[PDB]
Amino acid sequence: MKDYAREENGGLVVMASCSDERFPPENMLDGKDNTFWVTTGMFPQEFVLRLESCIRVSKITTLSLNVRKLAVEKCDQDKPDQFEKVFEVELANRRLQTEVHQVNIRAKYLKFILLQGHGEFATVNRVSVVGG
Amino acid sequence: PIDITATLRCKVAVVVAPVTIPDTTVSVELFLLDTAGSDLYKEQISQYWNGVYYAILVFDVSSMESFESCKAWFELLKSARPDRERPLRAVLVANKTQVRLDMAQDWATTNTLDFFDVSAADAPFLSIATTFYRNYEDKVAAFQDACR
Ligand SMILES: [Ca+2]
Known part of the structure; x- marks a missing residue:
């Protein structure tokens, strides 16, 4: 039904492993894929997404550059204590990259780990998490 | 710190040092992998190991052995890279306790390595x-350009 990572919908990054104030986490949640969060060296890096509430998630979608391997985990607790794996995936080398994932999980938190990149640095341009 | 607006991190084979870039508001943390740490070995065997593309080669002025040892390393480091497309940025460093520093500067220059004599400071970093x-x-x- 709805994309709760959106931001006008409560989306919020709480736990990013690197930041440049020019390309901050919040860029991932503005619907506009010409803006991005950038990693600033070495892998892995990761960030934690909080949804306005715990929702049944049906489809996770990431838009990126230079990411080689991507891992996602969930936590349906109110505090992000224990995360559980959802999926891990290897990305062709590309030029922006879309990774759509039909899923059936319950989550309040989503951790995205960029386990490795195709170069030194990598961006994440959009995170979309749809459910209700 | 806390004027910094971004912190970059960089894996560096030496065979965590934060360095602010003038005249920027940016900080670069060098993750120094001393061979025989063994930080370097832990990383090479690691799952997701990406190879290393930055080195600091150090030698003792009075041991030609240690200098030639630095050349071997450099050629290896070059050959061991997964991604031919990214070059190997390296920096040669002389330091005390034989070696012709005139000859050492040269080799480095011929080989596009930056040279620094530390006998008898943070410049190589x-x-x-x-x-x-x-x-x-x-x-x-x-x-930014790619995604418009
Ligand atoms: Ca964006």
């Missing part, structure tokens, strides 16, 4: 740090 920052600033604009 400042040097690797700026180099790295330059790539960041380039890639980062390519990204």
Whole structure:
């Protein structure tokens, strides 16, 4: 039904492993894929997404550059204590990259780990998490 | 710190040092992998190991052995890279306790390595740090351009 990572919908990054104030986490949640969060060296890096509430998630979608391997985990607790794996995936080398994932999980938190990149640095341009 | 607006991190085979880039508001942390740490070995066997593309080669002025040992390393490091496309940025460093520093400067120059004599300071770090920052600033604009 709805994309709760959106931001006008409560989306919020709480736990990013690197930041440049020019390309901050919040860029991932503005619907506009010409803006991005950038990693600033070495892998892995990761960030934690909080949804306005715990929702049944049906489809996770990431838009990126230079990411080689991507891992996602969930936590349906109110505090992000224990995360559980959802999926891990290897990305062709590309030029922006879309990774759509039909899923059936319950989550309040989503951790995205960029386990490795195709170069030194990598961006994440959009995170979309749809459910209700 | 806390004027910093971005912190970059950089894996560096030496065979965590934060360096601020002048006249920027950016900080570069060099993750120094001393061979025989063994930080380097832990990383090579690691799952997701990406190879290393930055080195600081150090030698003792009075041991030609240690100098030649630095040349071997450099050629290896070059050959061991997964991604031919990214070059190996390295910096040679002389230091005390034989070696012709005139000859050493040369080799380095011939081989496009930055040279620094530390007998008898942070310049080799400042040097690797700026180099790295330059790539960041380039890639980062390519990204912005790529996605319009
Ligand atoms: Ca965006």
